[PDB]
Design a protein around this ligand. Structure first.
Ligand code: MG
Ligand code: MG
Ligand code: MG
Ligand code: MG
Ligand code: MG
Ligand code: MG
Ligand code: MG
Ligand code: MG
Ligand code: MG
Ligand code: MG
Ligand code: MG
Ligand code: MG
Ligand code: MG
Ligand code: MG
Ligand code: MG
Ligand code: MG
Ligand code: MG
Ligand code: MG
Ligand code: MG
Ligand code: MG
Ligand code: MG
Ligand code: MG
Ligand code: MG
Ligand code: MG
Ligand code: MG
Ligand code: MG
Ligand code: ZN
Ligand code: ZN
Lengths: 50, 67, 60, 144
RNA sequence: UUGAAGAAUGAGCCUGCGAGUUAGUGAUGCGUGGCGAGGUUAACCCGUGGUGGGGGAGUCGUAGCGAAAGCGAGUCCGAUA
RNA sequence: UGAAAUUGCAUUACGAGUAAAGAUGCUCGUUACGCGCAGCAGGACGGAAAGACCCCGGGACCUUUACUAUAGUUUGGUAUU
């Protein structure tokens, strides 16, 4: 509850590529990251699903 | 009476051409977020069975070729 | 009663099947009603099912 | 002139039965079972692992599915076709290979391990790309 | 049974009887015989004369790999890596 | 006239030891002619009962706000209407 599991999906293809954890109090808002999309075949921006 | 095969064994183990008994690696069905890509890759293939376990599997199979 | 004097409908036997599926033996009885009939000028009571009542198979 | 009393089996053909529990000069008393326990009286099932989750339940099920309409091919290789049809085998049909060995009433895809120096015309169901290339280079063809 | 002459069990004695068997065209080895890239029949039919003959339907071997489509001395994960 | 329980045996001493840790049967000694009859109960861990106490495995019956069901009781809908 305090450190939940969050899924990072590409902002291009909506592909739920990664899963990680955060604190939900230190980072109340959805996280932006620069991850690698196996579908888009390059590094795209990944956002926490909502 | 024909002797039946073991249904879980039917569903879980393959027998290769040379006679090896192989199972799917265990531990990747869920709880995969904390597992690294290395741990997941280690659990992602097929495992050749040990001698005693392979003999037990071939006994449980009724001459069934595995899956 | 549970037997229809017309069409000879009789109870069926099956299972109580709970949430745990612990089956128990039980019965299904036909919806038998006791009604006055006048057949060939004879007045009497008859135990008839509602299916033969709906079909008009009994002369009231 | 052999007569019936000079018929005897081959040495080692008729192994003698081992009769158990017939004195201690042989497998006597416990009859090879040891003392006490389960094994002294019945047997142990092979699916049983003593109470620990067994192998056939700790391993994940191989999933997937079975194709209900999958049909297998009786495969023949070019080395076999060269060996069984060496003398400039002109046309080889499914009847010819089934006469040699292809297990008739089946489909007869021809595969391509081997060299196939001879020239053949194989009318068969399906073939591999390598087998077709080797057959055509040798001077022949495939059909059907 | 760690250990019994044991003051641990059983047996008064003799005679008789009393416990690893049988069935699968079961599973898996070995010996042996037949045939051999092939082996073998089941039910059944004929022999009212049997243990012999037919019957190849099926089945195991003949190619594997893949969840499978499929491809095939390769195939699958993979990007015709 | 005529049983019984019991019974591995037998030409079946005692002391101090030793030993599955309390020995007629083992050791070292001591004593002791053979066989009866009537008696007593210290021992043969005497007989009788596969300990009933204790633990372990199984069962049975009893209890309840253990679980899961269910007869009965009750609610409404619908058929009879
Ligand atoms: Mg999954
Ligand atoms: Mg992962
Ligand atoms: Mg109505
Ligand atoms: Mg003995
Ligand atoms: Mg015993
Ligand atoms: Mg023991
Ligand atoms: Mg044992
Ligand atoms: Mg069983
Ligand atoms: Mg064993
Ligand atoms: Mg457990
Ligand atoms: Mg021992
Ligand atoms: Mg003891
Ligand atoms: Mg004794
Ligand atoms: Mg004694
Ligand atoms: Mg005992
Ligand atoms: Mg006794
Ligand atoms: Mg056939
Ligand atoms: Mg002592
Ligand atoms: Mg003494
Ligand atoms: Mg002596
Ligand atoms: Mg006396
Ligand atoms: Mg007395
Ligand atoms: Mg006593
Ligand atoms: Mg006892
Ligand atoms: Mg109980
Ligand atoms: Mg009511
Ligand atoms: Zn993406
Ligand atoms: Zn009726």
């Amino acid at each position: 509850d305090v450190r939940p599991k969050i899924t990072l999906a590409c902002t291009e293809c909506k592909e739920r590529n990664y899963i990680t954890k955060k604190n939900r109090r230190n980072n109340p808002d959805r996280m932006e990251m620069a991850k690698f999309c196996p579908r888009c075949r390059k590094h795209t921006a990944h956002r926490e699903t909502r | 009476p024909k002797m039946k095969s073991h249904s879980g064994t039917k569903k879980r183990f393959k027998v290769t051409g040379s006679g090896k008994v192989t199972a799917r690696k265990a531990g990747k069905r869920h709880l995969n977020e904390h597992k690294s890509s290395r741990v997941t890759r280690r659990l992602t293939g097929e495992t050749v069975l040990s001698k005693g376990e392979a003999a037990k599997v071939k006994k449980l199979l009724a001459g069934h070729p595995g899956r | 009663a549970a037997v229809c004097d017309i069409c000879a409908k009789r109870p069926g036997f099956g299972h109580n099947v709970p949430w745990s599926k612990k089956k128990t033996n039980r019965r299904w009885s036909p919806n038998i009603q006791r009604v006055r009939v006048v057949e060939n000028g004879t007045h009497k009571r008859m135990n008839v099912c509602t299916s033969c009542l709906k079909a008009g198979r009994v002369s009231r | 002139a052999i007569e019936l009393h000079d018929l005897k089996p081959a040495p080692g053909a008729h192994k003698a039965k081992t009769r158990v529990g017939r004195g201690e000069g042989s497998k006597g008393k416990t009859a090879g079972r040891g003392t006490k326990g389960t094994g002294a009286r019945k047997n142990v099932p092979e699916f049983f692992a003593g109470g620990q989750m067994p192998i056939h339940m700790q391993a994940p099920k191989l999933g997937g599915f079975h194709n209900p309409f999958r049909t297998e091919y009786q495969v023949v290789n070019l080395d076999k076709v060269e060996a069984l049809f060496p003398k400039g085998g002109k046309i080889t049909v499914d009847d010819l290979v089934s006469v040699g060995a292809v297990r008739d009433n089946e489909l007869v895809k021809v595969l391509g391990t081997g060299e196939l120096t001879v020239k053949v015309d194989l009318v068969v169901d399906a073939w591999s790309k390598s087998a077709q290339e080797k057959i055509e280079k040798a001077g022949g063809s495939v059909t059907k």
